[PDB]
Amino acid sequence: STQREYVFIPITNSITIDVKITIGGSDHITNIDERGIHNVLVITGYAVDEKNGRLVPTLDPCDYVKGILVAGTPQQAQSNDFLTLKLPANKLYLIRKKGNISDDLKIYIPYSSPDARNSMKTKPVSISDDTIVNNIIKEVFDKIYNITQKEKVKIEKVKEDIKELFSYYALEQ
């Protein structure tokens, strides 16, 4: 297989570090060629626990989060808070698919537990205020794809379509 894992994209101040291996070679599935992000791996039936940033499993397909694919490892001190799984290469859920993939998957998602005492409520959170998205490029879209501004001029299409396509729900706690 080609081991990977998943990261989310909220407006939240919790996106500091969740990965050791970022490249694992010279291949990613969420490649970029002057059309913005490709192959956005979408999950549904979940929300984000952005404060204590993690994906909390609710049980409504109305809730969802859309992040990207990172081919590597999240600190390897996990499975206390994550979920691992291998897929038959189309149990995925993409956005703007590019092509066929390498038959094998391994993705670790930042997961959280219920703590069921409060009547938690889901709310829609859209990527807005392109200042924080400028910071987002400065923090979660410079080092992961530094080939941008070195192979792609379109550093504007990226912020536009992050404004448009990346949206998610939260827990409001």
Partner 1 sequence: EELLMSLKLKALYPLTGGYNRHSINPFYEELVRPTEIKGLWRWWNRVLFNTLAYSTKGKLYTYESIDRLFEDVFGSENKKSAVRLEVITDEGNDNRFELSYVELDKVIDCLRNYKRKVSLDFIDNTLIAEIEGSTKIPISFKSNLDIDKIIKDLVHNNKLLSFELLGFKSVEIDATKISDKKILKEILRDLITNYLEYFNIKQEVTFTLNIYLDKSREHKQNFEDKLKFALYSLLVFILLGGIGRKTSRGFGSLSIIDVKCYDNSICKKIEDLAKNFLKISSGNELKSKIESILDCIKNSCIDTLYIENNILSEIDPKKNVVYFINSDLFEVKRINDKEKVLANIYKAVSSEGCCIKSIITDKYVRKSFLIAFGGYRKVEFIKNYLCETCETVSSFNIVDFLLSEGSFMSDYILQYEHRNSLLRFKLISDNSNNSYLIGYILHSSYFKKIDIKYVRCILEKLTYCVI
Partner 2 sequence: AIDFLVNILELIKEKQCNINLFSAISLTSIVYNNFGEFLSNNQSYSTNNPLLKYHIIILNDKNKTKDVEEKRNIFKREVAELISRNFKLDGEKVRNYFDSLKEVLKSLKYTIVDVEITTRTRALIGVSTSLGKLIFGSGISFDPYMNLPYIPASEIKGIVRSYIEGKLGEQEAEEIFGNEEREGNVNFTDAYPTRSKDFLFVPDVITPHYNGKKSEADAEPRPVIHLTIAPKVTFRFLIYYKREDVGKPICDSMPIILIRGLGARSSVGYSLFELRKIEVIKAA
Binding site for partner 1 (CB under 8 A): 35-36, 42, 44, 60-62, 64, 66, 88, 90-100, 103, 124, 126, 164, 167
Q: Identify whether the C-beta of residue 17 lies closer than 8 Å to the C-beta of residue 10.
A: no
Among 26, 80, 88, 99, binds its own copies (CB under 8 A): 88
Whole-angstrom Cα distance, residue 45 to residue 157?
29
Whole-angstrom Cα distance, residue 36 to residue 98?
12
Among 1, 13, 44, 75, binds partner 2 (CB under 8 A): 44
Closer Cβ to partner 1, 42 or 155, answer by number = 42
Whole-angstrom Cα distance, residue 37 to residue 123?
25
Helix, strand, or coil (residue 159): helix
Determine the interface stretch with its own copies among 24-32, 42-50, 136-144, 158-166 (rule: CB under 8 A): 42-50
Q: From the list partner 1, partner 2, its own copies, none, pick the one residue 151 interacts with, judged by a Cβ distance below 5 to 8 Å according to partner type.
A: none
Closer Cβ to partner 2, 69 or 71, answer by number = 69
Q: Which residue has the tokens 């990226």?
A: 158
Whole-angstrom Cα distance, residue 128 to residue 9?
12
Residues found near partner 2 in the complex (CB under 8 A): 42, 44, 60-62, 64, 93, 95-97, 124, 164-165, 167
